[PDB]
């Protein structure tokens, strides 16, 4: 029983992979996911691995288990870019972040307001801040209608009938080709955040083997299918 | 009397501005500063204005005050860039972030591990992730000796005779000109975060008028002295 816990989002890629690893080697690999609160008590008892959707959020969650995990051992394996997700078909013809600042649009950004550890913290501001123009930053912010954590493993999008755009991650789109239209953020503005994992202290050899599988050729191509990169 | 509460860092520019405002108008402006827990209690009683050193941190701090502050009213006014602070004279010859990834160095980064609301959360990863190389990202993380909130109001770095490099903000270097050697981060990698203010619901006109002064020609120039920019 190789048990994994982390946020919704990368779970889809990790379930493909755990599916494979199970029928190939017989090792039962469980992928637990969602908001930290919904699986904390459970994982407090049996987490083998914690996986994460950014470094800051991984650091914060692993620090919540005390002696069980040594946050020094967090391992970044892949990265992926932030995206703009619009309404299907992109009717407002949004071309990038600057466009979101300039038009009368309604933006939702992935902030948790110190209420939970989430992968989106600091993302919107680090991208728009790279315009180095205070008016644009001000304009972008005045168009923000909601500061809510990334929907992650939920298929529902906050304010999905009211908002015009969401700052989110490519992998969410890849996993839900269904919802919205992805728009590429300017290259000189965009940020990339990592997928990581950490093995518990004592990690059985069964665990260490799965972690290594995550860098194998089969795992790499699955991760790549969801927009997770290495180079 | 106008009572301000917020993190160390922007406080040096603000004490200046406040002194100059008092000189002119005869209004008493108090600048309280430091980690949130050290003044949270006093603020819950008399805060007229919360000031912030990034958007995510300001949002999180203002949300702690319940109804007293409406978080939609947060106002970005200035930005500044992150920097590398090395030991005096830069004896390891650090040239930028990629250099910090490649050399043997001890780096301290401004993360609060979900245990505090701090300006630096997400900064180091957003900068090094723009290299779009997982090994570099990896090598950088492996040189980090401490994840601790920015020193802010302390004229003292964490482990300041121990670490080789701190990821910090220009305004810190500006405020502590005799400590360490500032090294500029690659333009294609660096992130910029904002100064911001918010008034309590029901802010007096006295309070509103000081906020207006933060954008006057005189304030602009004090802010610029400590590294805060608009364009």
Q: Which domains does chain B have, with CATH numbers?
A: 1-80+194-231 (3.40.190.10), 81-193 (3.40.190.10)
- CB nearest B126 (choices: A114, A122, A133): A122
Assign A34 to helix, strand or coil.
coil
What is the dihedral sign for C-alpha A127, A133, A136, A141?
positive
- CB nearest B60 (choices: A113, A123, A191): A113
Q: What CA–CA distance (Å, rounded) separates A225 from A51?
A: 18
Beta bridge partners of A109: A147
Q: What CA–CA distance (Å, rounded) separates B118 from B132?
A: 26
Q: Mutating which of A35, A40, A55, A188 best tests the B interface, going by the most B Cβ atoms within 10 A?
A: A55
Q: What CA–CA distance (Å, rounded) separates A199 from A71?
A: 10
Chain A residues close to B229, C-beta within 8 Å: 132, 134
Q: Which residue of A has its CA nearest to B55?
A: A125
How many residues in total does chain B contain?
231
Cβ–Cβ contacts within 10 Å for residue A190, how many? 22
Q: Which residue of A has its CA nearest to B147?
A: A59
* A200 DSSP 8-state letter: P
Method: X-ray
Chain B residues close to A56, C-beta within 8 Å: 111, 121-122, 125
Q: A113 and B71 in contact by Cβ < 8 A?
A: yes
Token digits of residue B140: 């950088």
Phi, psi of B208 (to 5 degrees): -60, -40
Q: Which pairing describes strands B2-6 and A165-169: parallel, antiparallel, or unpaired? A: unpaired
Residue A226 in contact with residue A175, Cβ under 8 Å? yes
Residue B182 in contact with residue B85, Cβ under 8 Å? yes
Q: B134 and A193 in contact by Cβ < 8 A?
A: no
Those residues with Cβ within 8 angstroms of residue B96's Cβ, 6 or more apart along the chain or in another chain = B84, B183, B184, B185, B186, B189
What is the dihedral sign for C-alpha B136, A53, B185, B151?
negative
Those residues with Cβ within 8 angstroms of residue A207's Cβ, 6 or more apart along the chain or in another chain = A2, A48, A49, A199, A200
Residue B46 in contact with residue B3, Cβ under 8 Å? yes
Nearest to B127 by CA among B142, B143, B115, B109: B109
Q: B121 and A121 in contact by Cβ < 8 A?
A: yes
* B37 DSSP 8-state letter: G
Q: Mutating which of B137, B143, B144, B167 best tests the A interface, going by the most A Cβ atoms within 10 A?
A: B137
Token digits of residue B115: 């245990």
Q: What angle do CA B129, B133, B136 make, to 5 degrees?
A: 80
Spell out a b/e string for B99-122, using b for 16 or more CB atoms within 10 Å of the CB, else e: bbbebebbbbbbbbbbebbbbbbb
Q: How far is CA A139 from CA A56, A104, A144, B180, in A?
A: 27, 10, 9, 36
Long-range CB contact pairs, A23-27, < 8 A, 24+: A27/A2, A27/A206, A27/A209, A27/A210
Q: How far is CA A214 from CA A20, A223, B200, in A?
A: 11, 9, 50
Number of H helices, E strands in chain A: 9, 9
Alpha helices in B51-148 (DSSP H): 55-62, 97-102, 123-128, 134-142
Residue B191 in contact with residue B126, Cβ under 8 Å? yes
Cβ–Cβ contacts within 10 Å for residue A171, how many? 24
């Amino acid at each position: 029983d190789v048990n994994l816990y982390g946020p919704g989002g990368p779970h889809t890629a990790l379930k493909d992979i755990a599916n494979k690893y199970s029928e190939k080697t017989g090792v039962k690999v469980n992928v637990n996911f969602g908001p930290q609160a919904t699986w904390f008590e459970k994982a407090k008892k049996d987490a083998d691995i914690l996986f994460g959707a950014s470094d800051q959020s991984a650091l914060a969650i692993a620090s919540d288990f005390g002696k069980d995990f040594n946050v020094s051992k967090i391992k970044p394996l892949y990265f992926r870019e932030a995206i703009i997700l619009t309404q299907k078909g992109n009717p407002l013809k949004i071309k990038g972040l600057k466009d979101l600042a300039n038009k009368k649009v309604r933006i939702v950004v992935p902030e948790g307001a110190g209420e939970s550890n989430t992968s989106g913290t600091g993302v919107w501001e680090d991208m728009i801040g790279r315009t180095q123009d205070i008016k644009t930053i001000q304009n972008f912010r005045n168009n923000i209608v909601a500061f809510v954590p990334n929907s992650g493993s939920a298929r529902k999008l906050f304010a999905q009938d009211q908002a015009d755009a969401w700052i989110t991650w490519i992998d969410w789109s890849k996993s839900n080709p269904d919802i919205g239209t992805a728009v590429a953020i300017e290259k000189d503005l965009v940020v990339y955040r990592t997928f990581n994992v950490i093995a518990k202290e004592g990690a059985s050899k069964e665990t260490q083997d799965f972690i290594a599988y995550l860098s194998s050729k089969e795992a790499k191509e699955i991760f790549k299918k969801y927009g997770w990169r290495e180079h």
